[PDB]
Write a protein that binds this ligand. Structure first.
Ligand SMILES: CC(=O)N[C@@H]1[C@@H](O)[C@H](O[C@@H]2O[C@H](CO)[C@H](O)[C@H](O[C@H]3O[C@H](CO)[C@H](O)[C@H](O)[C@H]3NC(C)=O)[C@H]2O[C@@H]2O[C@@H](C)[C@@H](O)[C@@H](O)[C@@H]2O)[C@@H](CO)O[C@H]1O
Ligand SMILES: CC(=O)N[C@@H]1[C@@H](O)[C@H](O[C@@H]2O[C@H](CO)[C@H](O)[C@H](O[C@H]3O[C@H](CO)[C@H](O)[C@H](O)[C@H]3NC(C)=O)[C@H]2O[C@@H]2O[C@@H](C)[C@@H](O)[C@@H](O)[C@@H]2O)[C@@H](CO)O[C@H]1O
Lengths: 163, 155
């Protein structure tokens, strides 16, 4: 065959849950996490640190995106299976990254081979140089066993077979 | 030398159009998100070129029970229709929302409803998409506002 066939896959990921991808994400592909909520409140009941993750088949964290309200930073990192975290990249001021977001948000990751480009709504927040390479085979959503900055269910959409 | 891609988000009301800040070209994607599924009069989602050609017209026709795909030049007649039968069957397990994705593959538009490819549409007019539109009679099959997301600067 000569024509290009791409694919859309849709996943509902609860806080504290993971999904295995039916179509892996590789160079040229995209994943967007859609949240139907955004909670940036301080004080009692304030959200715990909340992460969205792209994992390889052996459980490496290819990209970990940790939104830390109290510390007021977004941390980007990677981690081999059963190993220490690698070198963090940080973006300061969580709320500033969600200006004009309203009551929902999206976090998009482009796999560009050597880098992951992360875009919050329309704003590129990092061109992250990869610390671990390879295909993404699962996604996960960690709210430190408690209150999340996002909706209880986040919808992940993958666009694959692009290249 | 690095690739910089872009996400753009548009809120398109029924009977409205939006100009794209970043045009959709070969390798790019547009997804239309509806927060309702009303399965209502004929409803269309359109990709238009700078000169007002309909590069892709997607018409959902509930009563006729078909989805019609076509193109047309500015100020000119419609071209050759491609049809997909049974509208509801394309939205199996959709619930109360839906998404319609168009991949610009250069020679074809691949249209995917939720996860299901419904057509590999052979282009009848080529070129970049510079605007989107959403047509209906309050009788749309989709929500009054549809959110379009474009992914551009891919290739
Ligand atoms: C200034 C500085 O360098 N600080 C470092 C901290 O940021 C490190 O904290 C960990 O950072 C990781 C990313 O680099 C990651 O976010 C991790 O939390 C996540 O992973 C752990 C297991 O390692 C747990 O599973 C957590 O639940 C999980 N959290 C989320 C939201 O996904 C961070 O570690 C946790 O948070 C910090 C603040 C401490 O409370 C730790 O005890 C927690 O485990 C830190 C360790 O790499 O190193 C510092 O130097
Ligand atoms: C079997 C066959 O060939 N049938 C043909 C019909 O499908 C043709 O209907 C038009 O089809 C067009 C795509 O090929 C297009 O969907 C069009 O409607 C759209 O464009 C018109 C202007 O031309 C209006 O702007 C409509 O509002 C717009 N529709 C939407 C949803 O945005 C179709 O024409 C309309 O719908 C049909 C069913 C009739 O009611 C027409 O009078 C309407 O104008 C048809 C005409 O090209 O030719 C048949 O042979």
């Amino acid at each position: 065959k000569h024509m290009t066939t791409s694919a859309v896959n849709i996943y509902n990921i609860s806080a504290g849950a993971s999904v295995d991808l039916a179509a892996p994400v590789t160079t040229g592909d995209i994943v967007t996490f859609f949240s139907s909520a955004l909670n940036l409140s301080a004080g009692a009941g304030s959200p715990n640190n909340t992460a969205l993750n792209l994992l390889s088949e052996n459980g490496a964290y290819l990209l970990h995106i940790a939104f830390r309200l109290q510390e007021n930073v977004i941390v980007f990192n990677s981690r081999q299976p059963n190993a220490p975290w690698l070198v963090e990249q940080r973006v300061s001021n969580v709320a500033n990254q969600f200006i004009g977001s309203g009551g929902k948000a999206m976090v998009t990751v482009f796999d560009h081979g050597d880098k992951y480009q992360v875009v919050i709504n329309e704003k590129t927040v990092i061109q992250y140089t990869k610390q671990i390479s390879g295909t993404t085979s699962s996604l996960s959503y960690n709210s430190t066993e408690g209150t999340s900055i996002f909706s209880t269910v986040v919808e992940a959409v993958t666009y694959t077979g692009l290249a």
